[PDB]
Design a protein around this ligand. Structure first.
Ligand code: CLA
Ligand code: CLA
Ligand code: CLA
Ligand code: CLA
Ligand code: CLA
Ligand code: CLA
Ligand code: CLA
Ligand code: CLA
Ligand SMILES: CC(=O)O[C@H]1CC(C)(C)C(=C=C/C(C)=C/C=C/C(C)=C/C=C/C=C(C)/C=C/C=C(C)/C=C/[C@@]23O[C@]2(C)C[C@@H](O)CC3(C)C)[C@](C)(O)C1
Ligand SMILES: CC1=C(C/C=C(\C)CCC[C@H](C)CCC[C@H](C)CCCC(C)C)C(=O)c2ccccc2C1=O
Ligand code: SF4
Ligand code: SF4
Ligand code: SF4
Lengths: 200, 86, 670, 184, 59
């Protein structure tokens, strides 16, 4: 009974053959044993790519944003509201078109891989710059894509929550007079009993 | 008195006969089923109307059907105990 | 031993009954699974498993009650204004119950103290705590901790006894042992233990509070160390109950401690007497009643009777400090125990029927016709007499002939035995009052009290008629001669013999629940109107009394229109006009919801299941049309289940309606 | 000739122009921010809540919670200003004319609910089709159940594609029509 | 941790200038105790998985 390389105190996750993290098989909960892991790979790759683009845009907006005629909020979270509804509508339209056409209308966890079991996360976009590495460094390129995607996902999460704890821009990290985060102003039962809101 | 009729779909279960609380039903020989027997109701004058025979019948729709006739009730069909009508 | 405690049956629903082993072919399977869940008798395996299940389930429920007590204690320690209530109980409404500020629910919390807003609780837990010498938050913390520990202990014991008890287990059948140890060690040796608790912690504390030292020098005096106060410090001679404590408006706690000591002594002496006492006559009862359902019915009837005694004794035999003036608390303590008395009496009747069907009955079932016939006659006699005095008064008052009605100012029906029942209390010829509030004044019983007591007797007798008719005619009847083979609960025996619907003892309980509900709704209304009209209320310094209902009972309760107008309409103004009013918004809403639920029950009560089955089939056609096939086939509720749902919704809605109606009014008036 | 008195109080538009087809042109209604009844009702709300607030201590937590409630009430007053309310009640109205571009319109909630309700129904139907057994309805195949639940998002397209391709409905001659009404 | 806190070792923040006895309540009201509980929760989820997979013999 082998153990996973990543978490050595847990059994090695089966159904996680070599895709990217075959050297550090990491599935403690076991979604790969519960779900079609090809769909899981597709979701992870789409999340990683969307988050790479999201980190780049989130960083860029406060400084080199400002499309001619669009208004500029310093807090990149507020940029959704302080943007033209027309540009946002066209952008969502383009995203939906790309999502629908790429999978030939089989955009569904049941129907995603039912007849066109092409490859997990492959869309034929820019494949001309791949496969010249003799299927050995192409796997390394896929590994780099996955690592950058996961790092970008965690980074975008951190950027969003930093902008929330600061309630301002992003890059003025630890702004003047910030003196630490205590901004979560939502009451809680433990908060109610601790702060003596109830009782007495 | 009620009206208890037996239809051809009977398969000779004998369950209807066993479920009857006043010995209204009986088994007669026949040749329309693999059991070579069908139910009969020779004594429906003693049929109270409990419809246990219909509960016990396993055919798709009951091979035995009890038709209630309230403007027809006799002392036997009413289960009169404190009072005699004879 | 415990290696057989496996989770493999958790996924296998319905394992306990062999009638559910065929699988969930229809939706009736779900309801049957829920219905047979606690029916240990009919479930699979030997009789030893029945004993194990019964005892362990008793322990689990005891743990549940302990968890509820722990929750109440934690609410009192950390979610309550018990501090300011301790300091000034006559100006602060008890409240250990808050509401979150969501969907505007903030409107439910109301001003109870200058530093607290919440829902006024009427459970009387604050008076219990004060009578239990609980002053600091630490005491409530440790009470909650002990109750949680008891919950864990009882849960673990219920878990253990499913395997400690075995096929050879027999300790539950040793009824001599059970009776002796219960009686002595609990009723005697724990009553004296509580007497010790009171003598050593209440009398050191409650007199200190009544002495005006709510300070109690903090812990310098309150934390015991007060052996210079004497046990009978302020008995003031007199007789227990004749003279109340003027400060807290209750019986002195020294007298309560003496009562508990003497009752424990009496119980211990009765346990000693039971070694040689009167027997050989209840012996047929002794041998024929060794069964689960019979002892369950006996205990249910006994506990329900004790509950009604508690309901009548908690109101005008004031034991708790500062509780007689807290009118909503008094009302709740009476009425809740009244309802529990009714429900547990009905359960006793049901389990008497179950015992008759499982075990073998006794001699009284052979002359059942004279019994359940003279019961019928007495029910008819007191129904055509008690109620109709109301109908007679109503008709002759409508006709404009008030001199011909049954009233005090007219033809009067004197309550002869009650008026000569000055034995109870036998207090001095005046009243007692604490602070602008009446503690207790003797209820002057007149004609209206006579008529309403006869109404109570009539309703009790009809409910008893239904229960005893179900019990005695369980095995067989002149109508159906093999009811024993039909089981305990069945819809009918068929449309034959004119119609046999609702002959089962279960259906007799089904009707008896309606009649018990109707019986003690009148009890609730009689109490709620009589106390307001003749006991509760303000005072005048010139010894004049201004009650809440201004003496409406003796002049209006003689006619049904009086009940409709002065009780269900005029006294419902508080609940009906309770929208946007901070404290009483939920009571108005719950009044509306209780009306809705009560009317909703009628759909199940009046209709049969065949119509609903045909409608479900019509809908299932549309479902099958769109390839939506529920393989757990939709079936309408069974006849017995339809009746059960109707009865439950009926009683719940009506109880909620009364609940809101009484509580909102008493909260507004106080 | 004064249609108000002619029809017992109710007034008629008397004008036939397309510009009056909107709900905002109705003479029964009026924008809430300039309606006397709206002002009086929310002022009474503020007054009642404030009067409740003064009953408590100044430094208590109840005082702070009542301040938060007052802020919520004032935010509600300023937020419903653009919503239409009747010229006699002051209670804002919900527009059910399919306007799509008014405050309080019922088109957006209708669209959202219809999408999510079709999603729920489609997920349930997909699970029932893919689990043609009673054992799978009492012991839910949770992986398949959540797979169908996630797959239900494309219901408005998949359902129509099944409708037109003969994969949703079933001919009446394949399901039980109902009770017999004749034979003899 | 108790030794270090009692002897005077502190984090460079004025919010931490409390005694070790009040450290728990002060930091619960400050926030870091909730975050520590979240992190110990994820680590204990992994520990629970370890226990479940060891007691069942999967590992
Ligand atoms: C997940 C990736 C992601 C998402 C969701 C968005 C979303 C958005 N971007 Mg954006 N952006 C991204 C990546 C992304 N961007 C990247 C990678 C870059 C760097 C090239 C930018 C550079 C950028 C600029 C310079 C601006 C935006 C703006 C905007 C907003 C208006 C929509 C738009 O520009 O339509 C584009 C449709 C085609 C919208 C919220 C605009 C905005 O609202 O700023 C206030 C704007 O001025 N973005
Ligand atoms: C956000 C905008 C957006 C856009 C631009 C598209 C665009 C497209 N989708 Mg699509 N889709 C979207 C949102 C969107 N979708 C959403 C939110 C869902 C989830 C319900 C889907 C679910 C979906 C499915 C399941 C399928 C598509 C398909 C298609 C393609 C067929 C177009 C066609 O022939 O129409 C013809 C022209 C018309 C006017 C018909 C449209 C009918 C309208 C609504 C009336 C096209 C590339 C199909 C395909 O094969 O993709 C290549 C397909 O099978 N989509
Ligand atoms: C068994 C009896 C019982 C009952 C009826 C209640 C009922 C209630 N408790 Mg409670 N409680 C109980 C036992 C009980 N508790 C016990 C034994 C403890 C000690 C562990 C507590 C500790 C406790 C706290 C600390 C709080 C409550 C709160 C509440 C209220 C809201 C609960 C909530 O938010 O839902 C939660 C629902 C779930 C977690 C779903 C499961 C509610 C009136 C809250 C309250 O009143 O807020 C003002 C609150 O803050 N309770
Ligand atoms: C009404 C409550 C109640 C009753 C009547 C009993 C009765 C009994 N328990 Mg028991 N038990 C209870 C609650 C109760 N328990 C709870 C709450 C726990 C959890 C702490 C236990 C834990 C427990 C254990 C661990 C054992 C008993 C045992 C016993 C038996 C002998 C103990 C004795 O002399 O007394 C006896 C049948 C013993 C037994 O079965 O003897 C063979 C035994 O080993 N009980
Ligand atoms: C059954 C429950 C119970 C318990 C656990 C206690 C516990 C206690 N009581 Mg107590 N008490 C109780 C019931 C109880 N009481 C009742 C019902 C009364 C009647 C009002 C009293 C009256 C009472 C008084 C008046 C005093 C106590 C005292 C005490 C404390 C020390 C005395 C002691 O333990 O006795 C030890 C046991 C004995 C004294 C009995 C010995 C008798 C011998 C063995 C028999 C031979 C006698 C010989 C033949 C002559 C102790 C906290 C004393 C106190 O304040 O201490 C703090 C004290 O002065 N109690
Ligand atoms: C000798 C000591 C003693 C003392 C001081 C008390 C004192 C009390 N008993 Mg009591 N009682 C005692 C012995 C005692 N009892 C014994 C030996 C028994 C067994 C027969 C009872 C059985 C008993 C019952 C059944 C009831 C009381 C009740 C009461 C209370 C009402 C008093 C009243 O109105 O009386 C007027 C004279 C009072 C606290 C009543 C109560 O608890 O009220 C709520 C109540 O219902 N007692
Ligand atoms: C100590 C009390 C006690 C005990 C141990 C039992 C034990 C038993 N009873 Mg019983 N019973 C009791 C009191 C008790 N009962 C009372 C007081 C009544 C009168 C109402 C009844 C009436 C009664 C009947 C009529 C029947 C039983 C039956 C049974 C047996 C199986 C029960 C079962 O599986 O139900 C499973 C448990 C449930 C279905 C509980 C469902 C919840 C109930 C029905 C609704 C409650 C609504 C709730 C209070 C309000 C909701 C709040 C709202 C705001 C949402 C079992 C031996 C049955 C049997 O066959 O006996 C052999 C049977 O037919 N009992
Ligand atoms: C069981 C382990 C444990 C737990 C639950 C705590 C819990 C706590 N420590 Mg603590 N601490 C620990 C071990 C632990 N410590 C150890 C081993 C050291 C020695 C390095 C310290 C040194 C330490 C300091 C110097 C301070 C705390 C403080 C605190 C409080 C705020 C959290 C914080 O900033 O910690 C920070 C903890 C560290 C930086 C040390 C972590 C090192 C390992 C991973 C543990 C909190 C009550 C602060 C406080 O409120 O004091 C009043 C504070 O100023 N701790
Ligand atoms: C014609 C055709 O075919 O097209 C081709 C084109 C081409 C080029 C050949 C192709 C490609 C590759 C592409 C497009 C590759 C893009 C890759 C990107 C944008 C990666 C971003 C990672 C961001 C990260 C990790 C962010 C990290 C952020 C971090 C760590 C933030 C860290 C912070 O601490 C810091 C630094 C500050 C604090 O405030 C907190 C935060 C912000 C969190 C394709 C796909 O083949 C297709
Ligand atoms: C309505 C009705 C039905 C049909 C009612 C059924 C089948 C009830 C089951 C419906 C579902 C399963 C109940 C689940 C709860 C409700 C869907 C929601 C209740 C809580 C809401 C307030 C959210 C019967 O089967 C029936 C049988 C015998 C006598 C009378 C009647 C009867 O009156
Ligand atoms: S139960 Fe029905 S099928 Fe069976 S013998 Fe009787 S009539 Fe025939
Ligand atoms: S209705 Fe009853 S009595 Fe009549 S034949 Fe059927 S079972 Fe016998
Ligand atoms: S109506 Fe219902 S309860 Fe009455 S006999 Fe027919 S099936 Fe039985």
């Amino acid at each position: 009974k082998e153990t996973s390389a990543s978490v050595p105190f847990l059994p090695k996750p089966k159904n996680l053959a070599g895709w990217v993290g075959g050297e550090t098989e990491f599935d403690p909960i076991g979604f790969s044993n519960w779900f079609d892991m090809k769909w899981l790979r597709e979701a992870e790759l789409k999340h990683g790519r969307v988050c790479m683009m999201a980190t780049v845009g989130f960083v860029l907006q406060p400084y080199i944003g400002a499309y001619p005629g669009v208004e500029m909020p310093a807090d990149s979270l507020q940029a959704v509201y302080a943007a033209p509804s027309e540009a946002w509508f066209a952008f969502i339209f383009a995203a939906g078109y790309i999502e629908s056409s790429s999978y030939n209308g089989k955009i569904t966890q049941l129907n995603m891989f039912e007849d066109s079991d092409r490859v997990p996360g492959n869309l034929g976009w820019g494949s001309t710059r791949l496969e010249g590495m003799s299927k050995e460094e192409s796997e390394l390129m896929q590994l780099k894509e996955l690592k950058n995607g996961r790092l970008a996902m965690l980074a975008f999460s951190g950027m969003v929550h930093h902008n929330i704890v600061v309630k301002g821009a992003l890059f003025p990290l630890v702004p003047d007079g910030w003196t630490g985060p205590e901004p979560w102003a939502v009451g809680s039962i433990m908060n109610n009993x601790x702060x003596x809101x109830x009782x007495x | 008195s009620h009206a208890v009729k037996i239809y051809d779909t009977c398969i000779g279960c004998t369950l209807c006969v066993r479920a009857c609380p006043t010995d209204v039903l009986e088994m007669v020989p026949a040749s329309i089923n693999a059991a070579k027997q069908v139910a009969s109701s020779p004594r429906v004058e003693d049929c109270v109307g409990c419809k246990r025979c219909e509960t016990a019948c396993p055919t798709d729709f009951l091979s035995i059907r009890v038709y209630l006739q309230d403007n027809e009730e006799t002392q036997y069909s009413l289960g009169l105990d404190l009072v005699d009508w004879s | 031993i415990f290696r057989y405690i496996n989770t493999t049956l958790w996924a296998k629903a319905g394992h306990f009954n062999k009638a559910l082993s065929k699988g969930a072919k229809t939706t009736t399977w779900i309801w049957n699974l829920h219905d047979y869940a606690h029916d240990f008798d009919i479930q699979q395996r030997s009789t030893g498993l029945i004993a194990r299940k019964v005892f362990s389930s008793n322990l689990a429920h005891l743990s549940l009650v302990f968890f509820w007590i722990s929750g109440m204690h934690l609410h009192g320690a950390y979610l309550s204004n018990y501090d300011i209530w301790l300091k000034d109980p006559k100006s602060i409404t008890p409240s250990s119950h808050l509401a979150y500020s969501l969907i505007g629910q903030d409107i439910l919390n109301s001003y109870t103290s200058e530093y607290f807003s919440g829902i006024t609780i009427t459970s009387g837990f604050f008076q219990l705590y004060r009578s239990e010498g609980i002053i600091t938050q630490s005491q409530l913390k440790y009470a909650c901790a002990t109750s949680l520990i008891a919950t864990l202990i009882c849960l673990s014991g219920s878990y253990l006894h499913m395997q400690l008890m075995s096929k050879f287990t027999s300790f539950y059948k040793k009824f001599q042992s059970l009776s002796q140890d219960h009686l002595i060690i609990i009723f005697g040796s724990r009553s004296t233990s509580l007497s010790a608790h009171q003598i050593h912690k209440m009398l050191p504390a409650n007199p200190l509070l009544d002495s005006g030292i709510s300070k109690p020098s903090i812990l310098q005096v309150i934390s015991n160390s007060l052996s210079y106060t004497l046990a009978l410090f302020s008995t003031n001679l007199s007789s227990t109950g004749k003279l109340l404590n003027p400060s807290t408006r209750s019986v002195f706690l020294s007298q309560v401690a003496a009562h508990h000591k003497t009752t424990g002594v009496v119980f211990i002496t009765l346990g000693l007497i039971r070694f040689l006492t009167m027997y050989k006559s209840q012996f047929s009862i002794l041998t024929s009643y060794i069964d689960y359902h019979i002892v369950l019915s006996i205990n249910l009837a006994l506990i329900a009777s004790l509950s009604i005694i508690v309901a009548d004794h908690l109101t005008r035999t004031p034991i708790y400090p500062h509780k007689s003036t807290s009118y909503p608390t008094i009302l709740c303590l009476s009425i809740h125990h009244a309802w529990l008395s009714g429900f547990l009496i009905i359960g006793s009747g049901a389990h008497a029927s179950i015992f008759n069907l499982l075990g073998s009955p006794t001699s009284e079932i052979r002359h059942r016709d004279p019994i359940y016939s003279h019961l019928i006659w007495v029910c008819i006699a007191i129904g055509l007499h008690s109620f109709s005095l109301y109908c007679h008064n109503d008709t002759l008052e409508a006709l404009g002939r008030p001199e011909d009605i049954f009233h005090d100012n007219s033809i009067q029906l004197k309550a002869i035995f009650a008026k000569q029942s000055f034995l109870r209390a036998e207090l001095q010829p005046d009243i007692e009052m604490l602070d602008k509030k009446i503690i207790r004044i003797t209820q002057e019983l007149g004609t209206a009290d006579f008529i309403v007591h006869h109404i109570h007797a009539f309703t009790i007798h009809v409910t008893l008629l239904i229960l005893s008719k179900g019990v005695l005619y369980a095995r067989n009847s002149r109508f159906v001669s093999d009811k024993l083979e039909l089981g305990f609960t069945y819809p009918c025996d068929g449309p034959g013999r004119g119609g046999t619907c609702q002959i089962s003892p279960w259906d007799h309980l089904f009707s008896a629940v309606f009649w018990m509900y109707n019986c003690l709704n009148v009890v609730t209304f009689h109490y709620f109107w009589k106390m307001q009209s003749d006991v509760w209320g303000f005072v005048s310094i010139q010894k004049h009394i201004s009650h809440y209902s201004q003496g409406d009972f003796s002049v209006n309760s003689i006619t049904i229109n009086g009940w409709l107008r002065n009780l269900l309409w005029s006294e419902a103004s508080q609940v009906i006009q309770s929208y946007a009013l901070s404290s009483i918004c939920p009571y108005g809403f719950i009044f509306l919801i209780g009306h809705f639920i009560w009317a909703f029950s009628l759909m199940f009560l009046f209709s049969g299941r065949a119509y609903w089955q045909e409608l479900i089939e019509s809908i299932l056609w549309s479902h099958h049309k769109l390839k939506i096939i529920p393989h757990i086939q939709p079936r309408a509720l069974s006849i017995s289940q339809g009746r059960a749902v109707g009865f439950i919704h009926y009683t719940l809605g009506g109880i909620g309606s009364t609940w809101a109606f009484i509580i909102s009014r008493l909260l507004v008036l106080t | 000739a004064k249609p108000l008195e002619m029809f017992g109080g109710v007034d008629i538009d008397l004008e036939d122009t397309p510009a009056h087809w909107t709900i905002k042109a109705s003479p029964v209604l009026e924008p809430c921010k300039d309606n006397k009844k709206f002002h009086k009702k929310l002022k009474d709300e503020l007054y009642k809540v404030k009067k409740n607030q003064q009953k408590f201590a100044e430094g208590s937590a109840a005082y702070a919670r009542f301040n938060k409630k007052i802020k919520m009430i004032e935010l509600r007053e300023t937020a419903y200003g653009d919503r239409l309310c009747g010229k006699k009640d002051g209670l804002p109205r919900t527009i059910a004319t399919g306007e799509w571009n008014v405050r309080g319109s019922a088109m957006w909630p209708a669209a959202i609910f219809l999408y999510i309700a079709g999603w729920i129904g489609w997920a349930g139907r997909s699970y029932l089709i893919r689990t043609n057994d009673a054992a799978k309805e009492i012991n839910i195949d949770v992986p398949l159940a959540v797979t169908c639940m996630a797959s239900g998002f494309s219901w408005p397209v998949a359902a129509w594609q099944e409708i037109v391709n003969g994969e949703m409905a079933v001919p009446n001659d394949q399901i039980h029509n109902g009770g017999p009404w004749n034979q003899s | 941790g108790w030794i270090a806190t009692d002897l005077g070792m502190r984090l460079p923040g004025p919010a931490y200038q409390v005694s070790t006895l009040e450290a728990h309540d002060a930091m619960v009201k400050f926030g870091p105790m909730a975050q520590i509980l979240i992190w110990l929760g994820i680590i204990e989820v992994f520990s629970f998985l370890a226990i479940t997979n060891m007691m069942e013999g999967t590992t």
